Structure 1
Amino acid sequence: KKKPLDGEYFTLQIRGRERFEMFRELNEALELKDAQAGKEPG
């Protein structure tokens, strides 16, 4: 949990509530793979 200084952070306005939940999902999806991507080679 050290250094939240990973990639520069940004913000984006998303109109619509249903659309928001959709983007949030794809966002967490990529973040999920990125978590297993930094997984040292077994």
Structure 2
Amino acid sequence: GSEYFTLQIRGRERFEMFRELNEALELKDAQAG
């Protein structure tokens, strides 16, 4: 989409694992000045 993409994840543990990865990538995005 123009502001984000969506993905449907089956299962709470699985979702929490993918959210940890996604938040970490967003932390990586912040490293550039």
Taking CA–CA contacts closer than 8 Å with sequence separation of 6 or more, which of the two structures ends up with the larger relative contact order? 2
Runs (5+) with no aligned partner, structure 2: none
User: 1 or 2, which has the higher helix percentage?
Assistant: 2
Larger radius of gyration: 1
Deviation above 6 Å: which 4+ runs of structure 1? none
Identity, in percent, stands at 97
Q: TM-score, normalised by structure 1?
A: 0.65
Q: RMSD across aligned C-alpha pairs, in angstroms?
A: 1.9
Q: TM-score, normalised by structure 2?
A: 0.80
- Aligned pair count? 32
